[PDB]
């Protein structure tokens, strides 16, 4: 409202300097030196300010180790073609091998959109920051009945990630990390300064921590951070990377009673400011590139992982994140989604594939919309199914891309209401062919391991719901070397993947499943055109017929109950079930498809169900033929020939 | 000097529940939880649970959920651990420790006898 | 849960040797692991922290050393007042858990 002229002695001269506010507060108008001035206890005796100082808590073991940056966001290709994320227009971009990038400058408006207090007037922060009000982003969570909170305030320069303990009484436990480039952190009040605070510093970048020493001592008690490792990952991984390492972090606790319950241990809320950690890097690194233009395979890449942690996230714990969407992005994206014929996506090129699915998914978001995507990962699953070798385990490559495309069909699982039943069937099915017993064998190596092999497995949205714990004991990889622990805490977490009840993500979408009596005796489904089969122990199955294969004098039964045009029937069929007729007159070599749309199962009379495999084409049949899958040395083994009539036979020998 | 002195032994009888007290000394009792291990003769270590002092903030975090019941009392500086259904399987020795994690101090051991 | 596993339930030395136990975790368990040493007819006494840094009081002969999933106790100057079973313990997510406990022997 004024001027004011600061003097002030520089090596002994009275040099004076003159800040004026009219031009200045009308130059910024969200400034407001009275607020601040205010705010600076200026008045405050040496003795209350010290008093303050001793408060906070200082880290004593004030060092850091170098640690290179890597390089995340690309150059500009060649000739990319510079979207604006506020003006996007249609025909722009052409299809998805022309070469495109995003601005930066407004493609961060959009993410940093919304505008609120950073920093709270809380008792611990009212110490050492002077209020803030910035355009930001946030994680916020909270567990133990809202009594243990936690919030990750972001910017495109800093992430701020602030733990809070009530005590069941009034009192509250407050822990503030703060990561982000050394100059850009926020402006600190009094006597403080940051190397004081400093927890792990490397070149621009430090992890400052925010707690009274009384506070400290009270989290110490249950959370014993690495701070140095966390600064480590946060700085050396890429975005894309470190967000997938938090993916499966979550993931591989959720399918365990891990976040059904959550604790306040070190690993939980580590992994709570990871997350934050997570969001931030992928706003930073669009901040920090400035007034250029980001790659658009980087955005669908980065932005894919967020989306998919945006939902783990909200499954185990009550999460919330506001202002890491830019619609701009998510418009361009499926204005893309328009050039490519979703029925024939599994003849691309997998990178070519891996990048389509991903703008699917950040394109349409909250899945409900249009559902043509499940026909995308339908044909990228059908496509590999045929060139993967029967029944042995997804190659690294070929998980990671069925992983991308998986999480559209998991969506339109959780829904209630069909969504297109037919395309989304057929997944099933072709993820129920891959789960073989050394499918399973490398999940559970996974799983013991960490490892991302048993971060995804086409068994867990497959139609086989014969694998108890026992039935996957068998399969386990029995090397000694591995923790026999984390072999068996790998079942029990595989396990409860596929629990039928409490999932809600396995069945339910089908029109053959109201026909079934028991659900719990159900062992395997197989959906074919204009039929699926039923197979289960139980006899009461409202089907056209029912097929009772030679079980044994043990195991409950063995019934194929085909529902023709998943249509049920009045009751269950009556009398003696029908005998499956055996097949000898049949030659090993066939030069055309006359198993095509069939399936072919392989169980033992005491064993039950081992592998399945569904004639897509013809090189599948022949890989069938020509390999040594038909081995009738052993007497206990048969093999079931299920065909789109609705008939189930049992090849008994070959010419 | 910082101790955590136990009682000597406590013998109950089956399906019966026990005291197993701990008393600490030499530091504010409040500004630390307290932590009960469980040891058989020869064997190794089983964590039962934990207390926050002065906010009796609970965390059976393992298998003794229905077994064990930890209390506190800020005027006698004391911590508790209620066993409850004794077993045969439950006779073993109970130390109470003090919890800066990892565990500072250990108490000498309370021995537990179920038998009639 | 988390397993600690002392894969060597007993091991053997002479008096001027030096000896490593090896703890071997089930998963990632981080810094947080605490080694403790029972001597017969004693309860369990707080040896190292953070699986490298040592309590006060402890002579310089033992050392701390490992992160993530391979941890191992440095004696270095054993004695004949060092025969005790050592067991490491991981406080980093709950339940915490021990080790199986590792036996050290003397020879003479």
């Known amino acids: 409202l004024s001027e004011v002229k600061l003097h002030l002695d520089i090596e002994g001269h009275a040099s004076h300097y003159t800040i004026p506010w009219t031009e200045l507060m009308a130059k910024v108008p969200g400034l407001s030196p009275e607020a601040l001035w205010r705010e600076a206890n200026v008045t405050e005796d040496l003795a209350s300010m010290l008093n303050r100082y001793k408060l906070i808590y200082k880290t004593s073991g004030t060092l850091g180790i170098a640690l290179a940056e890597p390089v995340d966001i690309p150059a500009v290709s060649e000739g990319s073609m510079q979207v604006d994320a506020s003006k996007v227009h249609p025909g722009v971009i052409s299809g998805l091998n022309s070469p495109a990038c995003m601005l930066s400058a407004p493609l961060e408006k959009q993410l940093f959109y919304y505008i609120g207090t950073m920093l709270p007037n809380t008792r611990p922060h009212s110490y050492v920051f002077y209020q803030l009000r910035c355009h930001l982003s946030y994680v916020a969570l909270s567990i133990n009945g809202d009594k243990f909170q936690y919030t990750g305030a972001m910017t495109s320069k800093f992430l701020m990630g602030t733990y809070k303990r009530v005590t069941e009484k009034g009192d509250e436990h407050v822990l503030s990390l703060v990561f982000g480039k050394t100059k850009d952190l926020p402006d600190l009040r009094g006597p403080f300064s940051y190397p004081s605070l400093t927890s792990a510093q490397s070149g621009d970048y430090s992890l400052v921590i925010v707690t009274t020493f009384v506070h400290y001592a009270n989290f110490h008690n249950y959370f014993v951070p690495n701070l140095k490792d966390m600064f480590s990952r946060a700085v050396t991984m890429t975005a894309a990377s470190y967000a997938r390492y938090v993916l499966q972090k979550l993931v591989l606790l959720e399918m365990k009673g891990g976040c059904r319950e959550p604790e306040l241990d070190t690993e939980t809320l580590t992994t709570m400011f990871e997350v934050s950690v997570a969001f931030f890097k992928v706003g930073h690194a669009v901040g920090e590139t400035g007034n250029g233009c980001v790659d658009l395979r980087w955005l669908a890449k980065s932005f894919f992982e967020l989306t998919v942690l945006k939902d783990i996230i909200g499954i185990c714990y009550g999460a919330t994140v506001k202002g890491m969407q830019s619609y701009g992005l998510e418009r361009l994206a499926a204005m893309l989604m328009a050039t490519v014929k979703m029925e024939e996506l599994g003849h691309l090129t997998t990178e070519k594939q891996e990048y389509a699915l991903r703008l699917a998914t950040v394109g349409y978001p909250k899945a409900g919309v249009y559902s043509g995507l499940i026909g995308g990962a339908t044909s990228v699953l059908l496509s590999a199914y045929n060139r993967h070798p029967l029944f042995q385990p997804l190659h690294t490559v070929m998980r990671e891309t069925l992983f991308i495309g998986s999480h559209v069909v998991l969506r339109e699982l959780r829904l209630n209401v069909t969504t297109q039943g037919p395309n989304l069937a057929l997944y099933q099915l072709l993820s129920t062919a891959l789960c073989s017993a050394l499918e399973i064998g490398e999940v559970l190596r996974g799983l013991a391991l960490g490892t991302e092999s048993g971060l995804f497995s086409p068994c867990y949205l497959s139609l086989r719901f014969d694998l108890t714990r026992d039935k996957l004991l068998s399969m386990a990889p029995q090397e000694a070397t591995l923790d026999q622990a984390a072999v068996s805490n790998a079942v029990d977490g595989f396990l409860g993947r596929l629990s039928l009840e409490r999932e809600d993500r396995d069945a339910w979408h089908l029109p053959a499943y109201k026909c079934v009596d028991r659900l719990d005796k159900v062992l395997m489904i197989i959906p074919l055109i204009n039929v699926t089969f039923i197979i289960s122990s139980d006899r009461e199955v409202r089907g056209s017929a029912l097929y009772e294969a030679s079980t044994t004098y043990l195991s409950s039964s063995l019934f194929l109950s085909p529902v023709i045009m998943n249509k049920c029937s009045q009751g269950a069929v009556a009398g003696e079930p029908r005998q499956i007729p055996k097949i000898q007159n049949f030659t090993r070599t066939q030069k055309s498809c006359i198993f095509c749309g069939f399936a072919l199962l392989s169980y033992d009379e005491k064993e039950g169900l081992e592998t399945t495999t569904y004639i897509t084409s013809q090189e599948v049949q022949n890989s069938i033929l020509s390999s040594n899958y038909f081995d009738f040395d052993n007497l206990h083994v048969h093999y079931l020939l299920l065909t789109t009539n609705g008939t189930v036979m049992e090849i008994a020998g070959l010419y | 000097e910082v101790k955590l002195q136990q009682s000597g032994a406590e013998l109950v009888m089956p399906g019966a529940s026990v005291k197993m007290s701990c008393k600490a000394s030499?530091?504010?009792?409040?500004?630390?939880?307290m932590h009960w291990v469980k040891q058989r003769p020869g064997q190794g270590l089983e964590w039962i649970g934990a207390?926050?002092?002065?906010?009796?903030?609970?965390s059976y975090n393992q298998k003794f959920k229905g077994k064990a019941t930890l209390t506190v009392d800020e005027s006698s500086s004391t911590a508790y651990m209620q066993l409850s259904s004794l077993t045969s399987e439950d006779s073993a020795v109970y130390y109470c420790?003090?919890?800066?994690?990892?565990?500072?101090?250990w108490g000498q051991g309370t021995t537990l006898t179920v038998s009639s | 849960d988390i397993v600690m596993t002392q894969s060597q339930k007993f091991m053997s030395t002479s008096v001027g040797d030096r000896v490593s136990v090896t703890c071997k975790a089930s998963?990632?368990?981080?810094?947080?692991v605490a080694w403790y040493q029972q001597k017969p007819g004693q309860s369990p006494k707080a040896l190292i922290y953070?699986?490298?840094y040592r309590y006060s009081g402890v002579p310089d002969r033992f050392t701390g050393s490992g992160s993530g999933t391979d941890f191992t106790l440095t004696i270095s100057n054993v004695q004949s007042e060092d025969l005790a079973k050592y067991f490491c313990?991981?406080?980093?997510?709950?339940?915490?858990?021990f080790g199986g406990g590792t036996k050290l022997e003397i020879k003479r």
């Open positions: 420790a003090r919890g800066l994690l990892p565990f500072d101090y």
């Open positions: 030499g530091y504010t009792f409040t500004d630390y939880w």
């Open positions: 207390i926050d002092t002065s906010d009796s903030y609970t």
């Open positions: 998963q990632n368990v981080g810094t947080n």
């Open positions: 953070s699986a490298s």
């Open positions: 313990q991981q406080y980093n997510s709950y339940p915490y858990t």
